[PDB]
Amino acid sequence: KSTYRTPNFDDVLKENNDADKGRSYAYFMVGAMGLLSSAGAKSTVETFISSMTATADVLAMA
């Protein structure tokens, strides 16, 4: 059939597009995933960095 007739997408389309309704709920999840990953990638770094500090039996002999 003709290429100018588009197939049906009515089972996946949102009734009210509201340009900032897919722009608010999509980006809130991408921001939350970067907030938790910037806090998790920091507790990791400072956990390895603190192993190089003085140990328990060196502080006792201070």
Kindly report the three-state secondary structure assignment for every residue of 18-33. CCCCCCCHHHHHHHHH
Give the nearer residue to other proteins in terms of CB position, either 11 or 48.
Answer: 48
- Min. distance of Cβ 47 from other proteins in angstroms? 5
- Min. distance of Cβ 19 from other proteins in angstroms? 7
With beta carbons less than 8 A apart as the criterion, state whether 53 and 45 touch: no
Q: Which residues bind other proteins (CB under 8 A)?
A: 1-6, 17, 19-20, 23-24, 27, 31, 34-36, 38-39, 42-43, 46-58, 62
